[PDB]
Structure of ENDO-1,4-BETA-XYLANASE A:
Amino acid sequence: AESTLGAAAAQSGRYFGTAIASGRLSDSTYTSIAGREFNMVTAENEMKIDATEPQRGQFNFSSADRVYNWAVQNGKQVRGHTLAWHSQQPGWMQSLSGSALRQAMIDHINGVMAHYKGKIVQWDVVNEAFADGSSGARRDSNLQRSGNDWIEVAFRTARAADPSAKLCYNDYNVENWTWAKTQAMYNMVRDFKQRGVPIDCVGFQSHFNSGSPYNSNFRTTLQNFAALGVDVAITELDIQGAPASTYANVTNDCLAVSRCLGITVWGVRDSDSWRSEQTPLLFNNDGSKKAAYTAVLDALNG
Ligand SMILES: *[C@H]1O[C@H](CO)[C@@H](O[C@@H]2O[C@H](CO)[C@@H](O)[C@H](O)[C@H]2O)[C@H](O)[C@H]1F
């Protein structure tokens, strides 16, 4: 067996990753534990639109490169996050609509992807485009108001910008097979595959909690999306209370699906999370391993 999460995941050809924040990189406990345990990194905030293009046409990759460089220096691959999203847009992009916004969205994808061309294994090209609830509608945003084709255009733009990256659609509350949101995403991906839209992967955020609880049918969700001809990935995992049983279940669901590339938990210690009050991660505040860590490692080791 293997003694760390990333190495244990690698025995089945998968990765075990985390979100990394540039502001925490002077914390020796964080950097040593993150370096030891994970083989995949996602920048927590540094590769988002506001951080990378603070003013139109004026890119700033300083903080993003700090995360990227840390990952490569520590032997990890990197998931880019995220190129088109309604949340966290810089004010200059919030003022744009229609065709002007479309051009800025395209320019933003091209500029960020060119900087990291051939260096990023997966990109979350589009994030959180569906509304929550029973409707299955697209979320309202300046991007969605520019037309239903905004998502497809982002994907076609990204494929041309860097043909070596796996292009993913990412979202939350899409893990339970029976939910309307899950079905809306499923039909979009099915449609994309029939029309030749270049989508290679689907990211399941996996923010499990009392209001959006884990269900055993997540495995069915993963299998059904994989059958559409896309890879699947667990991208921002955290579970309220960090129950060992649920952490083991999610891990085993990924291990049972051949195209489940790996799992990323959203943070290292409970105190590093935005949801620290629900103590939803695998390491305690002092860096020690909880019960959930042991369960995940055991599952990865079979
Ligand atoms: C999935 O959910 C995580 C947690 O909400 C998002 O990461 C958070 O993003 C916000 C907004 O940019 C930040 O304030 C938090 O520090 C960060 O943890 C992630 O982007 C999203 F895809």
Observations:
- The first strand starts at residue 15 and ends at 20.
- The pocket of ligand 1 is lined by residues 44-45, 48, 88, 127, 205, 236, 266, 274 (CB under 6 Å).
- The CA atoms of residues 57 and 107 lie 8 Å apart.
